[PDB]
Write a protein that binds this ligand. Sequence first.
Ligand code: HEM
Ligand code: HEM
Ligand SMILES: CCCCCC[C@H]1C(=O)O[C@H](C)[C@H](NC(=O)c2cccc(NC=O)c2O)C(=O)O[C@@H](C)[C@@H]1OC(=O)CC(C)C
Ligand SMILES: CCCCCCCCCCCCO[C@@H]1O[C@H](CO)[C@@H](O[C@H]2O[C@H](CO)[C@@H](O)[C@H](O)[C@H]2O)[C@H](O)[C@H]1O
Lengths: 54, 383, 85, 124, 75, 438, 61
Amino acid sequence: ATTFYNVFVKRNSAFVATILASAFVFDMTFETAIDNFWDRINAGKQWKDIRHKY
Amino acid sequence: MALRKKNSLLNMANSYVLDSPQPSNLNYFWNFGSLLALCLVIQLATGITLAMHYTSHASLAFDSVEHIMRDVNFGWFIRYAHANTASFFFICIYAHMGRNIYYGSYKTPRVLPWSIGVIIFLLLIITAFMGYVLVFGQMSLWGATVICNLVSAIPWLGEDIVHFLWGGFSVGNPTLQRFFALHYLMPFVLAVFALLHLIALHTAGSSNPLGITSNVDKLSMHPYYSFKDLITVFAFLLMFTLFVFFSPDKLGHPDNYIPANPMVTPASIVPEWYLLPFYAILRAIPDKLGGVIAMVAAILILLILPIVDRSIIRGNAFKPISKLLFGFFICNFLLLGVLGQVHIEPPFIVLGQICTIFYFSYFLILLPMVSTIENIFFYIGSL
Amino acid sequence: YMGWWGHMGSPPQKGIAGYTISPFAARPFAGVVHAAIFNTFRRTKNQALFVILPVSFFYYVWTQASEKNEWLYTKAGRHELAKAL
Amino acid sequence: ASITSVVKTSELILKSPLLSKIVVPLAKTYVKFSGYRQLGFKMNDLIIEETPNMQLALRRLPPTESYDRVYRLIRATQFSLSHKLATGNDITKPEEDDHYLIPYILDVEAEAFEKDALDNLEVV
Amino acid sequence: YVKKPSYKIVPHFLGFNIPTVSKWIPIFGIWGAAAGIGALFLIEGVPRTRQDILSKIPIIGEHWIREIPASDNPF
Amino acid sequence: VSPKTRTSNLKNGLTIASESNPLVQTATVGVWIDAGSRNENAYNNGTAHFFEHLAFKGTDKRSQHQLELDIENMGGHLNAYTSRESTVYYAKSFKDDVPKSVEILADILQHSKLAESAIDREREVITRELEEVNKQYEEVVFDHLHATAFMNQPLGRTILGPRENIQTITNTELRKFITENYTADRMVLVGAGAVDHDALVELAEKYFSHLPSSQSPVPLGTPIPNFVGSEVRLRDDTMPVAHIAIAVEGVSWTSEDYYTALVAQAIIGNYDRAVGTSRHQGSRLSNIVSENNLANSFQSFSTSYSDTGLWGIYLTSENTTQIDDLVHFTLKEWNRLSTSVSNLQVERAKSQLKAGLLLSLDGTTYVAEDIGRQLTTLGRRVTPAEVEAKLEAVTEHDVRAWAQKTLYDKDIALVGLGPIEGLYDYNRIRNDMSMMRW
Amino acid sequence: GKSTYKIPDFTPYLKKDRNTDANRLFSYFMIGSFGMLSAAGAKATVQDFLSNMSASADVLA
Ligand code: HEM
Ligand code: HEM
Ligand SMILES: CCCCCC[C@H]1C(=O)O[C@H](C)[C@H](NC(=O)c2cccc(NC=O)c2O)C(=O)O[C@@H](C)[C@@H]1OC(=O)CC(C)C
Ligand SMILES: CCCCCCCCCCCCO[C@@H]1O[C@H](CO)[C@@H](O[C@H]2O[C@H](CO)[C@@H](O)[C@H](O)[C@H]2O)[C@H](O)[C@H]1O
């Protein structure tokens, strides 16, 4: 736990780098997660659900 | 205590335009600052007026400028005033920068006003370039085409950036509308930076033509400089009047009174006169990317004057060799201007390269050498 | 580096008396004719070389270049133009 | 640049017989053409003073020398704004152009440069 | 008996010396990474960034290879 | 090369430690006790300091007056102080007056009367001392600094104790305190100067033989402190000079980082505008402060206790509009112990300390204080050769490591006294404990 | 009420484990989460907002 602090937080350069890398990962995964959720709550409604008829 | 000093708001005006302590010996070259303020005001007044009559749609832009010329009361005046004052803005800005280089205004303790100034100069170039596009005549279009295709030389992303700025695959309506919005905005940004460079300068105060301290002998900005500034205002307005009323198209290019035609390319794409030196620098480098870097470096290299001037003495009033070198530098900058409007033909190709080398070597070689030697001559020569 | 009135940052001054007269008591244009002629001549003579040398040089350069360019695009200059390209 | 640099380089030149033979006459001409003497300045009055080092050297001037300097700057400023030159006793004669400030600024700088050197010392 | 203190002046420039700067070299590394991550993050949306950088990353790279079915694409 | 410090024990477990110097004519004998204010609870806080007053108020044999005369006839003087962890009672005398002085000290420690009449008399004297320390600003600042840093803990109590306790201290509780604490196994009889060790040991066998031994004899310098980042402001706009202390939790005597912390302290160093040489000192903070007239003085300190410490700086300044700059620059200099220190600063500070730790010992009192302090904190005297080796082992890498664990981005205890309007709130001071650029 | 060395009662607010790395790390996890969402939010904002400047759907046709 001291180790975690020393590596990622103690130097601000490291902390800002950690925050931006986390932001990148969050951004990508959150996009994917919302996409799937939105598709489930709006099931059979969206174009992707009816497109197969055509 | 007097109201002008007591009240916080009044005190700020007071500190800049009334009680501001100035050197008592500023000569007429210190008046370009206020002329540039006058140009900036005329451009805002005429500019906002034209915006009330101009339509930014590409199907209507050129026609809206004709409407201004032909139908709007005094529209001809507002249009020509705006177009010509853009030329006078650059005459005054080159003069003001020339004054600053000759009198060493860029030296400590005034590096910050100088460096902000270099940014004001870039914003003025961008502002004037975008304004030129708004007419949507042939020079407007062919200007935007060629200048925004320089960005294509940025490696990897260059093409993508160009299409993003144009808002399409060519210069067209999207480009015109966005340049209108930006051309309206940029002069306000330019005004803010103008005000920042003055606030920065307030810590040291104005330099003076002798390059000595003026702390020994100060004059209030008003009335002395107020009334001195009127002389150059009236001199400026006389020159303004001769262009605007008697020869309104002397400084311009007829090609911009032909509506933009993406098919027909004009005889000669030459920029407005005040951009011509940078254009010549760009042509000198054969490489596309090289050329663009050189052109930008020709402006940003002004930022290193504070380093490369090694003199112990501020300014050129007392330095005969520096004065000669500066004379050659200024004339070379005008020759570059002239070479920007000749055709890319012998013998101007080689000549343009030599003038470009001379331009850069002033900052990189000659000024550091000459200023070092003059230091030694002052010391030995006065023993 | 610069102060304000009262603490401008001058080294202490002492022993200088300054005198001047009112603008209403002066002739503002006293000796203007003499200055416009003799003083302007003096000041211009002293600075003439610093303008004449660079201007004359760059004008000569331009003149030579523009005349060569003109000559290269004549019939007479066909061959020299062919070599230059 | 530093005044120290100017002074050291000048001393190298004045040492070399060859160099001095060609440079000292040039420098004398240069100073005649420079024309600061025609405004009643001494060379040292022209050195840039808006630097912490130079401000300190000016504070170390003897009061007399300091008062005289203030007068020369005010006098020159008045000639500047009038576009007149000094006449008669106001013109600085070559014998009056003494380096009154160089000793003081060389001491200020000596200390400042020693301070920089010593900030970088490494015990062995 | 010691006659004189024993020291050297290390080369310096603008108040920096090599011992000091060497301590900061790692930090410029991390800031450079932070700037790299940050820059790349900002242009993640640019199609060229995906085509040329992001889709080439092993395993993860398929996240950025996405085709609109030609039936659903007006252009 | 210093003479060897001889050490003997008695049967009860009293340590006798001596460093003879046949060049001097005076001697300092005294008793260093590994006991102080910290040994009190909250009800008997101030007892240790109270006892110091009563120790000189007469014994079972000699009355107060007889005591005074006996010391006057010796020729030298007696002195005592109580700190948080240490109590000292010593006697500076002539060479051959040592048997008298040991006899007097043994008497005042074992056989003090502590008569109700004298307790009652001192109870006013000590009450008046509560309102006159107020003047000793450095001490005020340090007392508040401990109070806040070790809030509601034994180290955080003052030495004087609260007014309430001073009124309720009885001879019974005084007797109980010195019976529990001033035990043979916690005491060192120290002789420095013109003393023979074997003579001193015989005098200890004669006078300190019937000292109580503690039930559980732990080794000397054996001790739970939980530092609280916190601030006390004692603003007083009527004072001309601001006094400010900033400290972080430091190192104990027996820390592996003890010398590393001292080197770090020396890198910041001390400064005093009244001393001629101070404007030329190498310390970066010294240069900033002197060039900018930010302070009258600063003094870096590294106070150790058995199980914790405080490491910090004490600043004084009349520049009340630039206190922010003074604190700003100070804390940025500490940041550089974490980010920037190299062989340059570390080797310079080691050189200054290799001398400094030996220079301090320049009279018999200082030598005795050194033997006493070290024996009661480490259980042995550390020879100059060992001290020189421990300092040599301190590398730049060690200092950076230590600072990054102890100073960088850590909570501070902060005390300001005087015209400290310009000292920003806790957050802004604590924000300077790190650098965003690093 | 009189002695200034008797620090007021702060026991309602003092954390027992205050000088542990665990303790500091937690608060920086909150600050860093906030910085992370702000960075992700700023990227989203900038990318979406500036995309207005890319060719619009009529142009792309
Ligand atoms: C809108 C454009 C600008 C305006 C309105 C402006 C206005 C002014 C004014 C009013 C002053 C003080 C009066 C004077 O000395 O003339 C001044 C000083 C100065 N300006 Fe500008 N300026 C502009 C552009 C620039 C540029 C482009 C530069 C530099 C590249 C610059 C650099 C300076 C410097 C260095 C000074 C201090 C000079 C001195 O007094 O010695 N300015 N400017
Ligand atoms: C530094 C300030 C400015 C400069 C240097 C500048 C420069 C220019 C230039 C060079 C043109 C091309 C002129 C032509 O040949 O017709 C132009 C056009 C235009 N400018 Fe500006 N401008 C400035 C400020 C403004 C401002 C503040 C507005 C406010 C909207 C504005 C509105 C326009 C409009 C509407 C046009 C197109 C109509 C026309 O060409 O006359 N300008 N500007
Ligand atoms: C009304 C108070 C608000 C403060 C800002 C307004 C303007 C202001 O300060 O005016 C002054 C009159 C100023 N002249 C000088 O410094 C000056 C100083 C010394 C000598 C001379 N000339 C010699 O004989 C001068 O000409 C000037 O023209 O600068 C403008 C640019 C300022 O505009 C702004 O920055 C705001 C915006 C419109 C750009
Ligand atoms: C200094 C900052 C750096 C430069 C800033 C870059 C500016 C613009 C870059 C990306 C803009 C276009 O980039 C594009 O962004 C849009 C939305 O924003 C994304 O579009 C995606 O999300 C949107 C909604 O969020 C949907 O309508 C779309 O169907 C989907 O594909 C694309 O997947 C991406 O390729």
